[PDB]
Every structure is written in structure tokens, then in C-alpha cells.
């Protein structure tokens, strides 16, 4: 992972293929499956974290200072200072992808060689990886800095397009995925009750 600072904001970029490249280069010359797994299209993760130019009519508030705290007591956090001395502190994850919270049913009992009925072996991967695949995000709404230039309210078409885009991202990447996750949790709870 690395971070990009520019006059209009801050981005984070995480190389999601890195661990597969490492696995492939650690695999001997005969592992065609690791090369096919690396060649399977995997984009990096880009997150626009901070936008200091949310509107076209606004001047950016340039980043004047940027740092990543890695301390055992303070935890992991990004610090950004803008040209108007706005201090913005954000917790960062220790990984490009957060580990999913263990499902209450992931008892890692290393003692059940329970013969999973062969009819479930044809589902390539644990059902959890499939749900993680559905919930995978490609974009997010950045933190918008309101540059404190007192002297006009921003403007209408471009404002409506920006609001439409932002609302669409919230609908697709947040609400719809939360509703699907809730339905899956409720289905699992009903099955466990029965």
C-alpha cells in the first residue's frame, strides 16, 4: 500500500495482486495454476480518501503536510494538514482489505474431518469468498472538505450531477450491499433455528 497526495486531495492505492505475485515467484517453474491465478484480472484498490476540491467553482485546499502514524499505543492513522491549517485525522486499516469478522459459525475445530457431502465440493471456494466478491467495492465517496472561503454559496446542473453521482455510489456500494448482507444473515439465522 501507498498514498498519493496532490493539490486537490489524498488517495490510497493497495496492490491486491502483490501476495499472488509473491506466491507465483515462490512457486517453482511447474506451477501453471499460480500464473493463471496472477493473470486472472485483478485491479489494485484505489480509495479517494480526502477531496479538497469537491466542486468546480471552488479552489482546492492543497495538502501542506501528510503522515502515517504507526504506533502500538496510538494505533494506525493518517494525518493530513491543509493550506488553511485544517487538521484531518483518519484511522487506516493494517491491511489493503480488512479481514472479515469471523462468522459466529467459524469454529476452527481442527478435529472435524467431517466428510462434507461431495455435492458441496463443486462450489469453487467457501460461500464466504463468494459473498465477499459480491460486497467488493470499486469506488467510494471521499471525505469532502468545505474550503472555508466565505463569500458565496456554491451554485445547478453540475451540482445535481454531483449529487446524483454521490447518491448512486451510496445506493450501490452501501445500501444495496448492506441489504443483501442482512438478507443472508437472516437466511442463515432461520436455517440455524430450524
Amino acid at each position: 500500500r501507498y498514498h498519493c497526495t496532490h493539490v486537490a486531495g489524498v488517495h490510497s492505492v493497495g496492490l491486491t495482486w502483490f501476495n499472488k505475485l509473491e506466491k507465483f515467484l515462490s512457486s517453482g517453474e511447474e506451477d501453471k495454476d499460480s500464473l493463471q491465478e496472477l493473470a486472472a484480472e485483478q485491479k489494485c484498490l484505489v480509495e479517494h480518501i480526502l477531496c479538497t476540491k469537491p466542486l468546480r467553482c471552488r479552489l482546492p485546499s492543497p495538502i501542506q503536510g501528510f503522515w502515517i502514524i504507526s504506533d502500538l499505543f496510538l494505533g494506525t492513522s493518517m494525518i493530513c494538514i491543509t493550506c488553511d491549517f485544517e487538521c484531518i485525522v483518519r484511522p487506516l486499516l493494517t491491511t489493503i482489505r480488512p479481514p472479515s469478522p469471523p462468522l459466529l459459525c467459524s469454529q476452527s475445530d481442527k478435529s472435524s474431518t467431517e466428510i462434507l457431502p461431495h455435492v458441496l465440493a463443486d462450489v469453487k471456494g467457501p460461500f464466504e469468498e463468494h459473498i465477499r466478491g459480491i460486497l467488493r467495492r470499486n469506488s467510494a465517496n471521499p471525505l469532502l472538505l468545505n474550503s472555508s472561503s466565505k463569500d458565496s454559496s456554491p451554485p445547478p446542473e453540475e451540482c445535481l450531477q454531483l449529487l446524483s453521482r454521490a447518491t448512486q455510489v451510496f445506493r450501490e456500494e452501501y445500501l444495496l450491499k448492506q441489504d443483501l448482507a442482512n438478507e443472508e444473515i437472516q437466511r442463515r439465522v432461520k436455517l440455524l433455528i430450524a
Binding site: 502514524i69 504507526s70 504506533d71 502500538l72 499505543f73 496510538l74 494505533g75 494506525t76 493494517t94 475445530d109
Partner: protein, 109 residues
């Protein structure tokens, strides 16, 4: 070796103890890097305690709470440390591993 239930819990606790970050007087590790690792390790300990992993054994639960730097529990075990300065050092180990010499007086008092 006493019971299967105890074995599974001991394994978890053993893992936590094994993963506890310790500063080495010769490692390229910066104090910040260490603090991040330590925080992560602590979060893991907290997760196991919240999940009620050790609810069947009061002693293992107490150890895990000690690992989290629970002051109430540390004080409950006051008979084992026998002295305030042993208590101080234990407190520093689990709550403040990167203590600066200038701050030591505050913790000692």
C-alpha cells in the same frame, strides 16, 4: 493435557502469548512500528474476550484480561506482584510499552 475443552482454549491463549510483541535491544524495528503491532495484538485479545472464548475458565479469562491491561484485575492479583514497582512495570508492559523516561514519574506515582 487435562481436557479437550481446556486444550482448545489453551491453544488460543498460547497463541496470544506467543504473538505478544516484545521489543528487542538489537532490532531495526522503530517504536512506531512496534506500537502498531502491539495495538493489533491487543485488539485480537479483546476480540477473544468479547466473544466469551474463556467464559468456561475464570483463570484463563483473568489471564486474558491481564493481557489487556485491565487495572482492576491487575490489582486483584496484587498478592502475586508483592510490590508497587512490580505493579508499575506490569502496568507499563500491558498499557504503555513505549513509555518515555520523562513520563515515568507520572506512572510511578
Amino acid at each position: 493435557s487435562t481436557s479437550a475443552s481446556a486444550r482448545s482454549m489453551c491453544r488460543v491463549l498460547d497463541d496470544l502469548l506467543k504473538k505478544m510483541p516484545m521489543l528487542h535491544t538489537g532490532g531495526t524495528q522503530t517504536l512506531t512500528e512496534f506500537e502498531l503491532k502491539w495495538q493489533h495484538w491487543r485488539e485480537e485479545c479483546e476480540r477473544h474476550l468479547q466473544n466469551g472464548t474463556f467464559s468456561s475458565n475464570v483463570h484463563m479469562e483473568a489471564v486474558c484480561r491481564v493481557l489487556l491491561g485491565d487495572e482492576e484485575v491487575l490489582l486483584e492479583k496484587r498478592d502475586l506482584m508483592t510490590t508497587w514497582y512490580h505493579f508499575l512495570v506490569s502496568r507499563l508492559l500491558f498499557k504503555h510499552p513505549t513509555v518515555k523516561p520523562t513520563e515515568l514519574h507520572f506512572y510511578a506515582q
